[PDB]
Amino acid sequence: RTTYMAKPGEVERKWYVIDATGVSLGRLSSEVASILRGKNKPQFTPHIDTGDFVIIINAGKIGLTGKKATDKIYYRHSQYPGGLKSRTAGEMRTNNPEKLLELSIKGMLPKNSLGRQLFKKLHVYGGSEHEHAAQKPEVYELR
Amino acid sequence: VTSAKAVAKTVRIAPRKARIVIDLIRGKQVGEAIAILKYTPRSASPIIEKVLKSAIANAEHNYDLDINNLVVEEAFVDEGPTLKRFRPRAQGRASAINKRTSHITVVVSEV
Amino acid sequence: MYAIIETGGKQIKVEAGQEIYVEKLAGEVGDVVTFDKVLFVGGDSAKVGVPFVDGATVTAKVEKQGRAKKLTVYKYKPKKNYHKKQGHRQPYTKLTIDAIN
Amino acid sequence: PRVKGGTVTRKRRKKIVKLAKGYYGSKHLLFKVANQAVMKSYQYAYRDRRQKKRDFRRLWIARINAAARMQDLSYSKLMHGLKLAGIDINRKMLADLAVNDIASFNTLADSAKKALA
Amino acid sequence: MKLHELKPSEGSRKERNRVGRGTGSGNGKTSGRGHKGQKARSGGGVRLG
RNA sequence: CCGAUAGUGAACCAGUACCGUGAGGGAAAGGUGAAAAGCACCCCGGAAGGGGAGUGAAACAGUUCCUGAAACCGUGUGCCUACAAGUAGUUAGAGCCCGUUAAUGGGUGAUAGCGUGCCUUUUGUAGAAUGAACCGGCGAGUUACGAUUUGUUGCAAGGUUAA
RNA sequence: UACUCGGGAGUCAGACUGCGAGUGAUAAGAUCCGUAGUCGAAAGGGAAACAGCCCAGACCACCAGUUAAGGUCCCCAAAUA
RNA sequence: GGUUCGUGGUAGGAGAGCGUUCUAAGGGCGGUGAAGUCAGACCGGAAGGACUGGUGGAGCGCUUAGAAGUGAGAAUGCCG
Ligand SMILES: [Mg+2]
Ligand SMILES: [Mg+2]
Ligand SMILES: [Mg+2]
Ligand SMILES: [Mg+2]
Ligand SMILES: [Mg+2]
Ligand SMILES: [Mg+2]
Ligand SMILES: [Mg+2]
Ligand SMILES: [Mg+2]
Ligand SMILES: [Mg+2]
Ligand SMILES: [Mg+2]
Ligand SMILES: [Mg+2]
Ligand SMILES: [Mg+2]
Ligand SMILES: [Mg+2]
Ligand SMILES: [Mg+2]
Ligand SMILES: [Mg+2]
Ligand SMILES: [Mg+2]
Ligand SMILES: [Mg+2]
Ligand SMILES: [Mg+2]
Ligand SMILES: [Mg+2]
Ligand SMILES: [Mg+2]
Ligand SMILES: [Mg+2]
Ligand SMILES: [Mg+2]
Ligand SMILES: [Mg+2]
Ligand SMILES: [Mg+2]
Ligand SMILES: [Mg+2]
Ligand SMILES: [Mg+2]
Ligand SMILES: [Mg+2]
Ligand SMILES: [Mg+2]
Ligand SMILES: [Mg+2]
Ligand SMILES: [Mg+2]
Ligand SMILES: [Mg+2]
Ligand SMILES: [Mg+2]
Ligand SMILES: [Mg+2]
Ligand SMILES: [Mg+2]
Ligand SMILES: [Mg+2]
Ligand SMILES: [Mg+2]
Ligand SMILES: [Mg+2]
Ligand SMILES: [Mg+2]
Ligand SMILES: [Mg+2]
Ligand SMILES: [Mg+2]
Ligand SMILES: [Mg+2]
Ligand SMILES: [Mg+2]
Ligand SMILES: [Mg+2]
Ligand SMILES: [Mg+2]
Ligand SMILES: [Mg+2]
Ligand SMILES: [Mg+2]
Ligand SMILES: [Mg+2]
Ligand SMILES: [Mg+2]
Ligand SMILES: [Mg+2]
Ligand SMILES: [Mg+2]
Ligand SMILES: [Mg+2]
């Protein structure tokens, strides 16, 4: 019958810049994932993309409660025998904050082709300077 | 009126060995297709050459078309009646052998 | 303007001159049907019923009494030798909306 | 008398083969795999004819929640207020209003806010 | 009786039951015999007493 | 009673061909057309085979020759497809292409949710337990004479004949 | 509903879970009994996936509503109560 | 025609039907095209039944009964 289904390009997609100073990693990532998915619009159609673009600055000051800065480990395997490698969360925050935020957010997106398209809409910077001033992004405040 | 054709029914060559040469002269001018068939070293080339020249001849005689403005409109190979033979293997058993035939069709039309 | 009427155990949004398909109603082709259960009238002014907007009705005209396309309901259980086949064809009533009150 | 089996088997198998038009590979050509494909498709249709209603209700709920969070209200609070105010509009119509009659949706949300307090 | 309207007495004739013709009739695979005994075999069974 | 996998093993040069030292075992194989009127003549080719012409109601009836299904092999094209993890479908669905036994129509489908074939045998099988390469034909509770019980019909303290 | 008379059967490899016992080592997805449930012959929702555990019994259609176990930050519907 | 209670299901019991070949009677169609075959978006609660168009080139349905060599996806099934 009669239920509204959106079409590609029919919904405006905006740009946001989010300051990540002091916020917890997961509590920031949940909000950002909801923004990327497009769940904050009454036009939300599950099978297409209606979400927004997100820029995250000051990723080097993201928060980690407890002893997570030393006791949380990130693992990789190269698919070669005995080729497992580890890395602690504080080390990545010091050295590659962008990749820490990207892993955290990527774990919270759907695991299909649409999720892989949504991941490409996230730009993470360790400093306070971004190169997307041409898109005229707005400021988004959490919660 | 505008197309002529000729077929070669139940030629002894197998279809898979003639299709590989037919796939070369499709949609080409006859003057070039004859040279294509003349300089390719396969066993199916003389048969297809004879079929193509027959089609050109009966285009020129039956329908009075211009030779220099002809192209190979379509060419295909169909299966024919196969002959069943045998080959004596070791320890007293025989194995099947298929002596396959084919039908070759080419159609020439002006362009 | 438009209204939200309730008919057939479910609710429908109707505008004037629209064509709608509903559950089978008692009526003949060309008759006049009125809906006395209106939940919401909108368009340049909004009045909400609790649960119904009293005094408001929608008038419609019967266009067709028929049955939908055929379905085939089929069930089976593997390894238990159980199958069951059945065809279905749901009857409907087609209406055209005349006026909203 | 003898009853040889002609004309009856082919007619019955061709219907099943025709029912499997559009299936990959030999599932639309051979009777034995086409039969299994058709049976499985009927079973899947029977199950999804039930799952469709749940799927659409979930979509409507998500859409209403998104539209009502812009009025500083949850879906939970809005639904409670609507029940408490006496309004009996289902999620389908509310989602429609949220999409393309947002003013009327805001009116209903205001009434729900009145009911809560 | 016109020989084209012969209607025999009602209830005097019934339809013979044919076993082993598909699972829709309830007498399909095993044909009313159960599973794998002496009584499921052709000509199988015990004496009268 | 059968109608060319049927009916004799054999509808046709069948106890033949073929197999075995031997006794012996033992097939496959029907149909042009009403009438050969069975394609004079021209063209390509060594020929086969074709394209015209002609005969014929029909040659897409041209010597496995009435009909000519499926597996299988090809040619042309409308929609989709080279960042994707897939019992191959089903439900939601844009875009593009069409136009029917005319009706809330047809084809293909980017993307999203759900989803471990059929049979047999088992307490329990998606099962790393069994069977099947695919398509077609053939292939399994019957008959005679007795026993018992239910239904129907005729007559009824009687009913009924067998050779 | 129960009982009597008559026609027709199939079944006599059971499984796990809670409780009461034996054998075992107060081991076993062990074995053998008593009692109740579920599977067998039962789909649907929850335990990630999962015959036997918890909720609950599919006549068919619906783009309707209220609830059960279990849940409401994101994957994933619903409290960043 | 109504009220109430029901309608998961293996082995298995009971009931009602579809379709195939042949026979009997009535009544039909077919060289202005039969059976078969191919394609469709039609009809019935199921097994199933029509209609239209191509190919085919001489036989075939319908109604009421009766009789069975009576319906195949599997047997390391037989033949092609
Ligand atoms: Mg099972
Ligand atoms: Mg006969
Ligand atoms: Mg058969
Ligand atoms: Mg497809
Ligand atoms: Mg629901
Ligand atoms: Mg019966
Ligand atoms: Mg049964
Ligand atoms: Mg079976
Ligand atoms: Mg058995
Ligand atoms: Mg046993
Ligand atoms: Mg037994
Ligand atoms: Mg025996
Ligand atoms: Mg024959
Ligand atoms: Mg014979
Ligand atoms: Mg000899
Ligand atoms: Mg003759
Ligand atoms: Mg010649
Ligand atoms: Mg023909
Ligand atoms: Mg004839
Ligand atoms: Mg064919
Ligand atoms: Mg990638
Ligand atoms: Mg791509
Ligand atoms: Mg379509
Ligand atoms: Mg069992
Ligand atoms: Mg076992
Ligand atoms: Mg395997
Ligand atoms: Mg075995
Ligand atoms: Mg095998
Ligand atoms: Mg017996
Ligand atoms: Mg009597
Ligand atoms: Mg009894
Ligand atoms: Mg005993
Ligand atoms: Mg025992
Ligand atoms: Mg026991
Ligand atoms: Mg104990
Ligand atoms: Mg134990
Ligand atoms: Mg045990
Ligand atoms: Mg039970
Ligand atoms: Mg269950
Ligand atoms: Mg379940
Ligand atoms: Mg677990
Ligand atoms: Mg599940
Ligand atoms: Mg029930
Ligand atoms: Mg509720
Ligand atoms: Mg039942
Ligand atoms: Mg019975
Ligand atoms: Mg006949
Ligand atoms: Mg015809
Ligand atoms: Mg038979
Ligand atoms: Mg077979
Ligand atoms: Mg074979």
- Give the sign of the dihedral formed by CA D45, CA D48, CA D49, CA D50: positive
Method used to obtain the model:
cryo-EM
* Helical pair D9-19 and D31-68, crossing angle rounded to 10 deg: 30
- Whether C81 and E23 lie within 8 Å, measured CB to CB: yes
Q: Which of residues 55-84 of D touch C (CB under 8 A)?
A: none
Residue D93 in contact with partner chain A when CB distance is under 8 A: no
Final resolution, Å: 3.0
Token pair of E20, please?
Answer: 């082993």
CATH for B3-109?
3.90.470.10
CB of D37 within 7 Å of some strand F atom? yes
Q: Of all nucleotides in the shown strands, which has a C1' nearest the CA of E10?
A: F152
D7 Cα: distance to centroid of ligand 47 (angstroms): 10
Q: Which nucleotides of F are covered by protein (CB under 7 A)?
A: 1-4, 6, 42-45, 47-52, 69-76, 83-85, 87-95, 103-105, 107-114, 117-122, 126, 134-142, 151-153
DSSP-based helix, strand, coil % in chain A, nearest 5 = 35, 20, 50
C37, C5 contact by CB (below 8 A): yes
Distance (Å, rounded) from C-alpha B104 to C-alpha B50?
A: 11
Where does residue E46 fall: left (phi above 0), alpha (psi -120 to 50 degrees), or beta otherwise?
beta
- Indicate the residue type of B77: V
CA–CA separation, D107 and A53 (whole Å): 31
**Which of A4, A40, A46 is facing D66, going by the closest CB pair?**
A40
Question: Hey, are the CB atoms on C74 and D42 less than 8 Å from each other?
Answer: yes
> Counting Cβ atoms within 10 Å, is residue D82 exposed (0-12), middle (13-18) or buried (19+)?
buried
Question: Cα A121 to chain center, whole Å?
Answer: 8
Q: Please name the residues in contact with D70: beta carbons below 8 A apart, sequence gap of 6 or more.
A: none
DSSP-derived 3-state class of residue D99: helix
Tell me the CA end-to-end span of chain B in Å, nearest whole number: 13
- How many C-beta atoms lie closer than 10 Å to residue D1's C-beta? 2
Q: Could you tell me if B110 and B70 are in contact, meaning their C-beta atoms sit under 8 angstroms apart?
A: yes
Residues 38-77 in C having a C-beta less than 7 A from any atom of strand F are 64, 66, 68-69
Of D56, D62, D67, the CB nearest to A3: D56
Separation of B55 CA and F151 C1' (Å):
82
Beta strand pairing call for C32-35 and C58-67: antiparallel
Strands, E assignment, C1-101: 2-7, 10-14, 19-23, 32-35, 38-42, 47-48, 58-67, 71-77, 82-88, 91-100
Closest nt to D47 (CA→C1')? Answer: F90
Domain ranges of chain D: 1-116
Kindly give the interhelix angle for D91-100 and D31-68, rounded to the nearest 10 degrees: 70
E38/E49 Cα distance (integer angstroms): 16
Nucleotide nearest to D59 (CA to C1'): G77
From chain C, the residues in CB contact with D45 under 8 A are: 74
